Amino acid sequence: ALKRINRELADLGKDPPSSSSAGPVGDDLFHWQATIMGPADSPYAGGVFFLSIHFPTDYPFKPPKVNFTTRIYHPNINSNGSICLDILRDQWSPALTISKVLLSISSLLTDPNPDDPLVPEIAHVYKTDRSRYELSAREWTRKYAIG
Amino acid sequence: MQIFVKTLTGKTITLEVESSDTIDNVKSKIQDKEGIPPDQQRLIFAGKQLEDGRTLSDYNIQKESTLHLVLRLRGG
Amino acid sequence: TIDEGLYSRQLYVLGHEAMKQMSQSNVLIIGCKGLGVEIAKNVCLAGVKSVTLYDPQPTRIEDLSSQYFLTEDDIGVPRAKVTVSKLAELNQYVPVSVVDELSTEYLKNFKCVVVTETSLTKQLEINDFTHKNHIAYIAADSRGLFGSIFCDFGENFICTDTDGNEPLTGMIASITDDGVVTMLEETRHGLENGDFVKFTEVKGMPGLNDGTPRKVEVKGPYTFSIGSVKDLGSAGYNGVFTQVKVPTKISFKSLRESLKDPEYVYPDFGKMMRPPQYHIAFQALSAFADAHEGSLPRPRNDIDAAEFFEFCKKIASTLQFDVELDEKLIKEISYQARGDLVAMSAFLGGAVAQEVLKATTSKFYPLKQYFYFDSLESLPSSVTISEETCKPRGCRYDGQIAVFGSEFQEKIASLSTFLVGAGAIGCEMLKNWAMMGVATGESGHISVTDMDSIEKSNLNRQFLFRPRDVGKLKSECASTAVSIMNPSLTGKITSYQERVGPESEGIFGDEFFEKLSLVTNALDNVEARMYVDRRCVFFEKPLLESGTLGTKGNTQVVVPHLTESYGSSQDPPEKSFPICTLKNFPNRIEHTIAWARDLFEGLFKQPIDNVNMYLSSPNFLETSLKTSSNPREVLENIRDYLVTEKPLSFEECIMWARLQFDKFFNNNIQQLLFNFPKDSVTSTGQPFWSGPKRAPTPLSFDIHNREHFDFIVAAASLYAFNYGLKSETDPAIYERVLAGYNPPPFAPKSGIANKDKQELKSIADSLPPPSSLVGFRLTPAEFEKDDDSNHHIDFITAASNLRAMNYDITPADRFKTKFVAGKIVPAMCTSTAVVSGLVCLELVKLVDGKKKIEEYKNGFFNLAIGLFTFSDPIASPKMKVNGKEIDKIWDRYNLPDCTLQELIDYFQKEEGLEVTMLSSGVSLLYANFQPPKKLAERLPLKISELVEQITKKKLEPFRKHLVLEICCDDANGEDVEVPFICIKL
Ligand SMILES: Nc1ncnc2c1ncn2[C@@H]1O[C@H](COP(=O)(O)OP(=O)(O)OP(=O)(O)O)[C@@H](O)[C@H]1O
Ligand SMILES: [Mg+2]
Ligand SMILES: [Mg+2]
């Protein structure tokens, strides 16, 4: 696991992710803290979201545990930071890098999926009253994702 | 060339291959027909476990050959 | 009336109907040597109605080579008489008897007749009767490293289950007018041509829901065809299909008919020309015995081999067998005729016992009809095997010396083995080692470790443990039992109660491992297997791995510097469902069971742990306010479980349970339907509640309903357990308390600054001080499936079935709920016997020190379908480092405890490589991209000092080495893999 994790870390170091920056916590290779920048064409524009990544002992044969630490008002992210992403529960394969997961999370932030939601109330607001959803998302990203 | 794969649970699979195909192509076909990733497949022919990077003709796998698809178990 | 407290794991393999039929079947076993006693033991453990033994031959010393119920004080007594008493203890529901004489007409009392150690004329006489009276007949034989099985279940045997797999079921998306059934998105039906299916909940084609099975024509992994459904309708939408398994008729031939034209089962496709040879060889053995007063050929005797080959020629000519006899193989069969190996006995006894169960249950596909097996690759080549070395010495190992010789016996007697685990496979392995004579010499020793204790369900397949042993340590009982079997093991076995893992490296350290000869795993999880594999790779020890699941099993061997390790390959991982599916949209009973388990944890475990931690840690609140993902939840839990909803009697527990029923089965469903009404549509215009999403309906509490009352009882009992109150089970109090309940009004909410922190502080200071509550604790509920009085499985079953009723899912019973929630692994004694036999057949290869990789075999089998297969182990990959051949697995660098700078300079000067990353354990000791100040601080330190500083933990005194992982680049910048580093402290 150590060699795979270091190869991913070095690859991240070589080519910057631009919109993301992941690295080990202190000196522990099995605990990373990533940062995601809110997309410009999204309600979360100008926001910094912190994620915690926990690599299991069986990496890359088991998915990393990725949890949001910043509060976000999204139909697919609940109050515990759990992310409704298929590649993290049962579609994980030992061929996906952390950069791919970060790109998937950014794509999820750029457009939510209310047809298969994790938070039914936010999904209902999104489907019925779009403007209220926009206002709530901007308020939340100003209150929590900035500062 | 047509070959048969028998699983440890009794299922039978028919594959259309050629003698020049590599083991990787056979594993990809098995994944298409079963969804088992190639890295988790254990294929046995005539007491030899087939390894990636080699061809069928390396194992003398001819038409109507039977392979076994096996796996390890965690109980006991 | 099956005792599920004992047959728990076996019922998940066989079923209730199968065991009901088993409990009405009589088994006669002729012969009480190692093979016969193995078969009888497995049958007694399985649970047949009764067993009868017939073996009037007096005991001899050599019989102790594989008969573990015989002692040296029993010499001269008939074998059955001395074996019956010890067999009667294995299972209390199975009587065991002895008959001093057999008559043909007496055979009509038995469902199955097993024959061992009987001549061919007697076998013909017995089978001529059993065949025409429709009695199952099995005949088994074990000669040295050769074995044979024959099954004859009659001309009209009916098999109800042919593979032992669960029926296949799936969700449909559409059925066209021509019967082309299509699965949901990216879902495989898994059917085969000729299968039968039945449909339900099909909309648009009401005629398919009657329940008539239909033929299946597979047209791809996602679609199949059922025929023409023109009349029933034009097109069908949604619905589910379930496979229908139909009985089959198998016709067997008598032994007399099948001697001329046998039908073979091939255990190995690598040697397909041998079974025809063994068919002649075993008949020649019978003829030779008939011509010499029942005496077999003497070990490694050339005159007897020549006479035996003449008999083989005569038989082959008589049967018109157009097969060229392989003289070497046939004479090998002659040489080992008097061999009697406990490993072969275990393997064949497991197989034969499974066949007996098939005969008595009409389940699984039986062997049809001849099964000839050999393990001739186990014959030693590093010692002398001749007539002088293989002659009997008048000891209990004569049956093994007749095959391997006395020098190999000396090699076996000085083994130093390490057995990890003491379960079913561990017990079988210890028995095999005791019979083989392992570690009975001056320099021999056995070490067995296991941290578990004996339970009632373990007695069904761990035959070394008795009901009096429940609650004691497994390793101690196993060591005592095997010391009883072979008294020479007294003082040669050491038992530990330690779990093998990172925390026990002070006990199983360098000194412990340096003295071993081999390691055998008998574990039940992959984490421990990987850990032991890494330890064996580091110390360069042989490893024997084995695993079972129901009727399936496998065995693997890891040989230093020859093969790959256990962890070089990947197995399919466990399936975990999406969180969105479990939270809101379940469609299977498994989803509801997972939800119920999470509910159990969230109601009776987490809040109690939070309350207990609040009353112990002095700085719990401040740490939790910024550590946990929801401090508000923790504060609410503490408040509710301390002050707000603390029960003072059991009536308050009942009221709490009623409130929780409303919360989790009536109000959340109403909120969900408020968010997504049943008439709502997706963004593409499709209905929302279609396909995998099932529209739920709220539950109204009815006391007369069984599931509602079960949930209330279980929840109230568990709450009382948490608060230490006196629970009750009389329905009168429940009906009286719940009668006067006024539900609080509920209305779904439509939604529509920094004061929240002030509110959290106000809640925090409202809690009673920890000093006011000293010595007060709440008992958390720790999940336990094997106890039927703690209300754990009862609560999970009730909650799961209530949530299934919410979403119109078919509820399950306590049996399936316990299987799913408990993560129970189905287990069988027969599979355990087979895997132990295979492992002990590989062990003698390891002892002989065989170097070629074609001489080892990894084995796989499924007893439900009678499939056996073997394959050579995969050789360890090689690589080129600095123009040298390096083993990717078994090679390492050995360096002193130098500084980081000296290590880097050594790798630059010696290997011509630039070090880029250096890590140890779970820490990054060195990276090429670290800032220069940090490096300059970390460069002049020794590796041990650097590890201690970075990990902030001093090295233990028993620590004698460090393992480092290094990633380095070549001169051109190409990354080159290198073996790990072993720093000597
Ligand atoms: N890390 C470990 N170190 C030592 N022994 C272990 C370890 N992990 C598991 N075992 C032991 O391995 C044995 C596994 O055998 P088995 O699964 O048949 O037994 P069990 O777990 O007690 O039974 P069951 O799973 O049927 O309830 C058990 O004795 C278990 O205690
Ligand atoms: Mg146990
Ligand atoms: Mg277990």
Author numbering:
A (entry chain C): 2 to 148
B (entry chain B): 1 to 76
C (entry chain A): 14 to 765, 780 to 1012
What are the paper's exact sentences on this?
Transthiolation reactions are central to Ub and Ubl conjugation pathways because they are used for transfer of thioester-activated Ub or Ubl from E1 to all E2 proteins, and from some E2 proteins to specialized E3 proteins. Here we isolate mimics of transient transthiolation intermediates for E1–Ub(T)–E2 and E2–Ub(T)–E3HECT complexes (where T denotes Ub in a thioester or Ub undergoing transthiolation) using a chemical strategy with native enzymes and near-native Ub to capture and visualize a continuum of structures determined by single-particle cryo-electron microscopy. The resulting E2–Ub vinyl thioether adduct was combined with Uba1 (E1) or Pub2HECT (a homologue of the NEDD4 family of E3HECT enzymes) to yield atomically tailored dithioacetal analogues of E1–Ub(T)–E2 and E2–Ub(T)–E3HECT transthiolation intermediates with substitution of the Ub(T) C-terminal Gly76 oxyanion by a cyanomethyl group.
To obtain doubly and singly loaded E1–Ub(T)–E2 complexes with and without Ub(A) in the same sample, E1–Ub(T)–E2 was incubated with substoichiometric Ub (approximately 0.8 equivalents) and excess ATP•Mg2+. Samples were vitrified and analysed using cryo-EM for doubly and singly loaded complexes to obtain reconstructions at overall resolutions of 2.5 and 2.8 Å, respectively. Densities for E1 and E2 active site thiols and Ub(T) Gly76 are apparent and consistent with covalent linkage at a single dithioacetal carbon. The cyanomethyl group of the linker, which replaces the negatively charged oxygen of the tetrahedral transthiolation intermediate, is positioned next to the N-terminal end of helix 18 of E1 that includes the E1 active site cysteine. Positive electrostatic potential of the helix dipole or hydrogen bonding may stabilize the negative electrostatic potential of the oxyanion intermediate. Although the local resolution for Ub is lower, it is sufficient to position Ub to reveal a conformational continuum with Ub(T) moving from a position next to the first catalytic cysteine half-domain (FCCH) of E1 to a position adjacent to the E2. The C terminus of Ub is covalently linked to the E1 and E2 active site cysteines, whereas the body of Ub(T) transits between donor and acceptor conformations through a 180° rotation and 35 Å translation as measured from the Ub N-terminus. We speculated that remodelling of E1 and E2 active site residues could impart directionality during transthiolation, but amino acids and side-chain conformations around the transthiolation active site remain relatively constant throughout conformational changes for Ub(T). Doubly loaded complexes represent those that are most adept at Ub(T) transfer. Doubly loaded E1 bound to Ub(A) and ATP•Mg2+ is most adept at Ub(T) transfer to E2 but prior biochemical studies have shown that ATP•Mg2+ alone or the Ub(A)-AMP adenylate can also enhance Ub(T) transfer from E1~Ub(T)20.
